[PDB]
């Protein structure tokens, strides 16, 4: 089965900068009639099909920016990136061809960028929702840097922890920042015996949280 | 232009069949070597097997994983390819590609040309429609270049939905959340971002889609007025 290894599995690089990724076989790709090893390397950006870059270890594919270059021979290879681009951001997975074929588990290439707050964003279950018993809060925490951040929900000036559920976008392309969802879900009876929701956003890049609320009565 | 497109997805139950499609054009299919690749959600691809070319007998070759429960085949009237899986279990739910692979040994090799996928779901869950819920700016709608909106898409059985904006007029600004399963039940939001001189002088709507309940439905998004 030929097993194929890549580590380390994630790597974060600043636009401009060098890169370069590693995989390795359980068992040597060189073919000792053909002298070249069967390796090759694709690239998957976030939600769309791979793409292959390169073959036979070192072969560029027709239409792939000189920028990328493969290496090495037997049971370990390296793809390089000379001069990173915002737009190289996505996963790369490397492919043996030498006995059937077998992937490696990819490595996947975030990009650095300057520290960003999330514009935050709260919405009061619809009044469609609410006819039929339940009630979603939902609170929009977009395009900040990095990943990490935290929320935290407050019903009548009280925290809030049960019935929270978080969700992370990948990195997006254009402007390298993330966002993420929070949403708080009720009945239609829970939302309605109380009167103010906020969503308390706190970041790597803030002193104080990012908030926003609204008040049930002022509809 | 080389042409890939994959069909027959959809939601089987556990110990089920399901035979994938996989339409071609733009290539002499006979010439090459063709391969079946699937990728779970959020992990990695994994090389499921092949049928080689005419001058190779169109022989079949599998993955350990599949191999003797899956089943290869081709119809070279038709230019196309089938993938024929048995008694499916949860781990084989996940996204299917069809892929063109070598045509010579000699000449190149790697697989060039790749289906977008179609998606498979193992489970007894039944299957259940979304409720498409409007995200509109209340107290908002005020004075501040950009304006936020989304639509909640709850309650729904499986996995995938497709959201768009304004029928896909509207692409720029627009994010789609990762959807979260609870109860045999998955819900997600997407977000939009566009100049408060277009909305709502101009409308927004999201159109959503989910074929294995084979709905489509629109939510114009309306400024809370208090
Ligand atoms: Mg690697
Ligand atoms: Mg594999």
């Known amino acids: 089965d030929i097993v194929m290894s890549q580590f380390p599995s994630s790597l974060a690089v600043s636009a401009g900068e060098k890169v370069t990724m590693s995989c390795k076989s359980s068992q040597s790709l060189l073919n000792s009639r053909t002298r070249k090893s069967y390796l090759a390397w694709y690239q998957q950006k976030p939600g769309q099909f791979p793409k292959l870059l390169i073959y036979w270890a070192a072969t560029r594919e027709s239409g792939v920016p000189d920028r990328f270059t493969g290496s090495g021979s037997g049971t370990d290879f390296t793809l390089t990136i000379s001069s990173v681009q915002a737009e190289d951001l996505a996963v790369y997975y490397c492919k043996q061809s030498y006995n059937l074929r077998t992937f490696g588990g990819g490595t996947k290439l975030e990009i650095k960028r300057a520290d960003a707050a999330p514009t935050v964003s709260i919405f009061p279950p619809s009044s469609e929702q609410l006819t039929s018993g339940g009630a979603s809060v939902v609170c929009f925490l977009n395009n900040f840097y990095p990943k990490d951040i935290n929320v935290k929900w407050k019903i009548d000036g009280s925290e809030r922890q049960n019935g929270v559920l978080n969700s992370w976008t990948d990195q997006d392309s254009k402007d390298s920042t993330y966002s993420m969802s929070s949403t708080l879900t009720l009945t239609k009876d829970e939302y309605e015996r109380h009167n103010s929701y906020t969503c308390e956003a706190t970041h790597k890049t803030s002193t104080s949280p990012i908030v926003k609320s609204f008040n049930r009565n002022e509809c | 232009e080389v042409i890939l497109v994959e069909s027959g997805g959809g939601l089987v139950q556990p110990g089920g069949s399901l035979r994938l499609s996989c339409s071609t054009s733009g290539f002499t299919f006979t010439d090459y070597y063709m391969s079946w690749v699937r990728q779970p959600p959020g992990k990695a691809l994994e090389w499921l097997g092949f049928?080689?070319?005419?001058?190779?007998?169109?022989?079949?070759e599998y993955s350990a994983s599949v191999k003797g429960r899956f089943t290869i085949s081709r119809d070279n009237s038709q230019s196309i390819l089938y993938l024929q899986m048995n008694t499916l279990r949860a781990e084989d739910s996940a996204t299917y590609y069809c892929?063109?692979?070598?045509?010579?040994?000699?000449?190149?090799?790697?697989?060039?040309?790749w289906g977008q996928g179609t998606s498979v779901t193992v489970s007894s869950a039944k299957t259940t429609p979304p409720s498409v819920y409007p995200l509109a700016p209340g107290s908002a709608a005020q004075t501040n270049s950009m304006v936020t909106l989304g639509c909640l898409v709850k309650g729904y059985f499986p996995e995938p939905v497709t959201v768009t904006w304004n029928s896909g007029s509207l692409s720029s600004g627009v994010h789609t959340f990762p959807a979260v399963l609870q109860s045999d039940l998955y819900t997600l939001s997407s977000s939009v971002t566009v100049p408060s001189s277009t909305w709502p002088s101009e409308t927004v709507t999201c159109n959503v889609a989910h074929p294995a309940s084979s709905t489509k439905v629109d939510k114009k998004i309306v400024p809370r007025d208090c």
């Open positions: 049928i080689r070319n005419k001058p190779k007998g169109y022989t079949t």
């Open positions: 892929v063109r692979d070598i045509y010579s040994f000699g000449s190149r090799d790697g697989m060039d040309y």
